[PDB]
Scaffold this active site. Sequence first.
Site, short mmCIF file in Angstrom:
data_model
loop_
_atom_site.label_atom_id
_atom_site.label_comp_id
_atom_site.label_asym_id
_atom_site.label_seq_id
_atom_site.Cartn_x
_atom_site.Cartn_y
_atom_site.Cartn_z
CE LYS A 143 6.94 5.40 4.04
NZ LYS A 143 6.57 6.14 5.53
N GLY A 179 5.48 7.71 -0.02
CA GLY A 179 6.72 6.61 -0.36
C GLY A 179 5.61 5.03 -0.55
CB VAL A 180 5.38 2.69 -2.57
CG1 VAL A 180 6.66 2.88 -2.92
CG2 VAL A 180 4.81 1.30 -2.63
CB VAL A 181 4.98 -0.40 2.25
CG1 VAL A 181 4.70 -1.10 3.08
CG2 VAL A 181 5.36 1.10 3.21
N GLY A 191 0.75 -1.26 0.32
CA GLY A 191 -0.15 0.13 0.04
C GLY A 191 0.75 1.37 0.13
NE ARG A 192 2.59 4.36 -4.52
CZ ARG A 192 1.69 2.97 -5.60
NH1 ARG A 192 1.09 2.27 -5.66
NH2 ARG A 192 3.02 2.82 -6.19
N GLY A 193 1.00 4.89 2.30
CA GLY A 193 0.78 5.77 3.50
C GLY A 193 0.83 7.03 2.63
CG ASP A 244 -2.42 8.12 13.03
OD1 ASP A 244 -3.57 8.45 13.08
OD2 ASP A 244 -1.56 7.92 11.43
C1 LIG Z 1 5.02 12.55 16.18
C2 LIG Z 1 4.96 11.15 15.42
N1 LIG Z 1 5.32 9.85 15.27
C3 LIG Z 1 6.74 10.21 15.88
C4 LIG Z 1 7.26 8.39 15.75
N2 LIG Z 1 6.84 7.96 14.99
C5 LIG Z 1 7.22 6.48 15.37
C6 LIG Z 1 7.05 4.96 14.00
C7 LIG Z 1 7.64 5.88 12.72
C8 LIG Z 1 7.70 5.19 11.97
C9 LIG Z 1 7.63 4.44 11.69
N3 LIG Z 1 7.49 2.80 10.59
C10 LIG Z 1 6.67 2.36 10.08
O1 LIG Z 1 5.20 1.81 10.67
C11 LIG Z 1 6.97 1.22 9.27
C12 LIG Z 1 7.99 1.80 7.95
C13 LIG Z 1 8.33 0.49 6.95
C14 LIG Z 1 7.25 -0.31 6.48
C15 LIG Z 1 7.92 -0.57 5.10
C16 LIG Z 1 6.23 -0.56 7.51
O2 LIG Z 1 4.84 -1.77 7.44
C17 LIG Z 1 5.70 -3.05 7.16
C18 LIG Z 1 6.83 -3.18 8.85
C19 LIG Z 1 6.59 -4.14 8.76
N4 LIG Z 1 6.01 -5.49 8.89
C20 LIG Z 1 5.01 -5.14 7.39
N5 LIG Z 1 3.99 -5.99 7.20
C21 LIG Z 1 3.14 -5.07 6.08
C22 LIG Z 1 3.22 -3.98 5.79
C23 LIG Z 1 4.41 -4.01 7.36
C24 LIG Z 1 5.80 0.21 8.56
C25 LIG Z 1 7.05 3.18 13.06
C26 LIG Z 1 7.03 4.02 14.34
C27 LIG Z 1 6.06 3.44 15.75
F1 LIG Z 1 5.12 3.62 16.01
F2 LIG Z 1 6.26 2.28 15.34
F3 LIG Z 1 7.62 3.19 16.23
C28 LIG Z 1 5.35 7.30 15.29
C29 LIG Z 1 5.02 8.90 14.56
#
Ligand SMILES: CCN1CCN(Cc2ccc(NC(=O)c3ccc(C)c(Oc4ccnc5[nH]ccc45)c3)cc2C(F)(F)F)CC1
Length: 293
Positions: A37, A22-24, A17-19, A130
């Site tokens: 990603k 970027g694209v995952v 998907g796309r958040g 979030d």
């Molecule tokens: C104030 C803003 N906040 C600051 C801190 N941020 C934390 C923060 C920021 C970025 C991330 N990144 C991702 O999830 C993240 C990053 C990359 C990918 C590919 C992703 O998707 C997957 C990863 C593993 N298995 C999967 N299966 C299907 C999809 C998938 C998720 C994860 C966090 C987390 F909350 F988990 F720690 C959240 C926002």
Amino acid sequence: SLHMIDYKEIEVEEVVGRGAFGVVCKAKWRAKDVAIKQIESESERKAFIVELRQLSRVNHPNIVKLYGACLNPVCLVMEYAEGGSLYNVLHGAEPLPYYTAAHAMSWCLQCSQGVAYLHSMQPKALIHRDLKPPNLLLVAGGTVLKICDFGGSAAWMAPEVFEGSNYSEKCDVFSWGIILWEVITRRKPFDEIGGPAFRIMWAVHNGTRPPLIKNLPKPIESLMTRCWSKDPSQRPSMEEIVKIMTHLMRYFPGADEPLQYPCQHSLPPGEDGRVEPYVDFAEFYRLWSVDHG
Ligand SMILES: CCN1CCN(Cc2ccc(NC(=O)c3ccc(C)c(Oc4ccnc5[nH]ccc45)c3)cc2C(F)(F)F)CC1
């Protein structure tokens, strides 16, 4: 910190998907399942760097794990979470899985454990901001939960946030409360309100909360509603939530049982401002009586 990766070692399989940016994609790297990603426009380059910095610090069982990255093109390589989102398990496509009160409570415990890790990071804490079931991944037969962030969220948003106040990590606590209600009832919070997001923000800002749950155990109702409180300072910290949920799990055995049985799930419309739970607390009350005389 991180381990660099060469993009030629990444076999890209399918787009997930796309958040926000970027694209995952699902992929394979050195013969292991990985989610990647990848950047799409030069516009997103700084957003990736931020996320790459954050994920390089984070190492926790209930948070998604960063294997490494390549820098041409810039691409994050994560450990692949296989079981899909919690939203999918709760409300997704036929057939929906059956789950127990123990699963519900274990999911929320695992979520508080991951958020408390983020809130405790040094020197500066990370706030999620979030938290909602589409951002909660399930693995190992739906028994292990992983927090992530793909970047409307109004139904789970603390009132001080969407009103432009100087918010804190307590906003995550409010979201956790809404999720607790959600997994217990298997209902979409504020689903009846609908319309655009500002209609939900208006309601919640005025004090609207998800309807109360019939037969809900007082210790759980008490926790849930504290998390909902308008004044952030009256919400418990995540560390307290972890502690309470850990103690409560004693009365919710079986959370290591994989989800496997399908479920034809009717949603009887709970009128009179009070809904029925999806999960069953009869075993909780019994186990509680045994301990308390
Ligand atoms: C104030 C803003 N906040 C600051 C801190 N941020 C934390 C923060 C920021 C970025 C991330 N990144 C991702 O999830 C993240 C990053 C990359 C990918 C590919 C992703 O998707 C997957 C990863 C593993 N298995 C999967 N299966 C299907 C999809 C998938 C998720 C994860 C966090 C987390 F909350 F988990 F720690 C959240 C926002």
